[PDB]
Design a protein around this ligand. Structure first.
Ligand code: GDP
Ligand code: GDP
Ligand code: MG
Ligand code: MG
Lengths: 295, 326
């Protein structure tokens, strides 16, 4: 029937729903296209599906030729959201997007959720993503970094040899950033904040004293975006169904920076593994091969 | 020789700057830096030994927690209530800036601050007591800056009628582990013969975002507290017995779930917008919270070793307790 999220890895053990994954990734019109994988990952109830909903609105507006909407319009769209399932979900619709110059690529949206058996699934989405958007609340804590270090090392260990770096882009997405008078919302404030915050954390906690070097050894690019609070109506509703105008002004403004920064055709980076670009079919094969290693 | 009238005038401007420079504000009474703990006895005695309050039994309301969690904001509303009670809607009028004596106007300092003005309130039945407001602040982020935050947190717990443990959004394992530590460090100095070491503990949870799970306020906080504790015990063995530990140190444990105050408060370093610019539900819940702590029938005299303590006795405990941690 309608598009929606598909449970592809489910969590004490884990399983790949290969038939569910393959029915998405093996469709005739995207099967041999190079795939761009955008992955949002983090703990339960941190607003991952809300941000994925705006990614979809951008993708569907681009597909159907202001993507955010009129203020008076309810958010009225296919939405990503017990939701307390540990595992990986992928959007059932793969988007075909033409890059400048004419190359058409497939765009997959991925959601990784968990609270450690979750090391496997965070590793898997890291290994299979063009951009891993690590979704944190308010600040970057020692435990956020300890976990990040663990699942990136765990993913790197399932990849036998690495002539380059194992992963591509890491983005720290900091939600409900409350100190724009110290670091401005968005990318440049986020960059200045990340490096200072990592330096402070490394010096406070010997368990992550090399996390900066480790992260940089793992990822070819590391960025950070400071996102404003979305307003009390979004924050206190189990399932926000209000209108665009009921979302805080600055959140919407920063959405207009963040979302195209990730999804504009000229920002889409094809997934690479072993120094070669990966098709949708190849993605399916890698999910199968990695799942086998972790089992 | 200056004129008589000019002499009294110059003395008059002298007493004008005297009152202005000593206007009611926060007083740093216990300070840390570098480690080691210093107690400004002269400053503390000037507060607690004022003639009219020296021998009254004392009610000590303490707000405690990590930096930048809105402790001084909540203290400012407590002051508004107490100044209202003193000589007279205590919250203010909607179109007016939040005005009054403020706390953050008078800091990354680790230690304890006490409001310089002691309030005398008449309880139901006519007993007048002294009310002291205390602000306790420090980081427990790292391995360093954790021994010293335990000490000052123990100190304000030992000396308070109610310890308002001010936490953001939820009760986390690290909040419970530090609580366990500083109530342990404070327990030792108590003799524990006639009474539990401490009186009331209140988990004040700020920016509660789940009223459809547990309602804002006291009844929601109590339904939330016990079930939250059982979870954290099961997950981190270091606090596996924290609920029994809490109930052995305190004679009362409560929890209050407080709304978010609005984006204007949240993103301004020192909010000076209008009362109307504070979230409506926040103000509603404040009208429950602040009287629940400060209404005359709720003021609990400080008790140590089975006996009610006076302001002057409170000074002597601070001087004695501080030497123990040395
Ligand atoms: N404070 C805050 N709440 C949000 C944000 N985004 C979504 N929410 C709310 O937080 C709750 C959890 O959101 P959800 O998207 O389901 O989180 P997920 O479990 O990570 O997918 C819902 O009530 C959302 O309305 C945000 O940026 N900040
Ligand atoms: N999100 C949120 N912010 C608050 C709250 N109360 C105060 N603030 C803001 O948080 C920041 C720190 O508040 P402050 O009272 O100085 O924190 P303190 O260091 O614990 O005294 C200020 O910008 C306040 O305006 C609250 O309940 N929730
Ligand atoms: Mg989700
Ligand atoms: Mg303070």
């Amino acid at each position: 029937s309608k598009p929606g999220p598909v449970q592809v890895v489910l969590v004490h053990s884990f399983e790949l729903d290969e038939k569910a994954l393959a029915s998405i990734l093996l469709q005739d019109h995207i099967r041999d296209l190079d795939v761009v994988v955008v992955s949002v990952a983090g703990a339960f109830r941190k607003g991952k599906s809300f941000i994925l909903d705006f990614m979809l609105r951008y993708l569907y507006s681009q597909k159907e030729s202001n993507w955010l909407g009129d203020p008076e319009e309810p958010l009225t769209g296919f939405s990503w959201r017990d939701p307390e399932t540990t595992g990986i979900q992928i959007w059932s619709e793969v988007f075909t997007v033409e890059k400048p110059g004419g190359k058409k690529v497939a765009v997959v949206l991925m959601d990784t959720q968990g609270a450690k058996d979750c090391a496997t699934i965070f590793a898997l989405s890291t290994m299979t993503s063009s951009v891993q958007i690590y979704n944190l609340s308010q600040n970057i804590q020692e435990d956020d970094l300890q976990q990040l270090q663990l699942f990136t090392e765990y993913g790197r260990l399932a990849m036998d040899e690495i002539f380059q770096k194992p992963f591509q882009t890491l983005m720290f997405l900091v939600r409900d950033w409350s100190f724009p008078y110290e670091y401005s919302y968005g990318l440049q404030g986020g960059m200045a904040f990340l490096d200072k915050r990592l330096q402070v954390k490394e010096h406070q906690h010997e368990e992550i004293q090399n996390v900066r070097n480790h992260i940089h050894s793992c990822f070819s690019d590391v960025t950070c975006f400071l996102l404003p609070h979305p307003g009390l109506q979004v924050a206190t509703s189990p399932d926000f169904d209000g209108k665009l105008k009921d979302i805080a002004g600055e959140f919407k403004e920063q959405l207009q920076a963040l979302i195209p920064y990730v999804l504009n055709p000229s920002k889409l980076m094809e997934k690479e593994i072993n120094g070669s670009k990966v098709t949708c079919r190849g993605l399916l094969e890698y999910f199968k091969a990695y799942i086998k290693i972790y089992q």
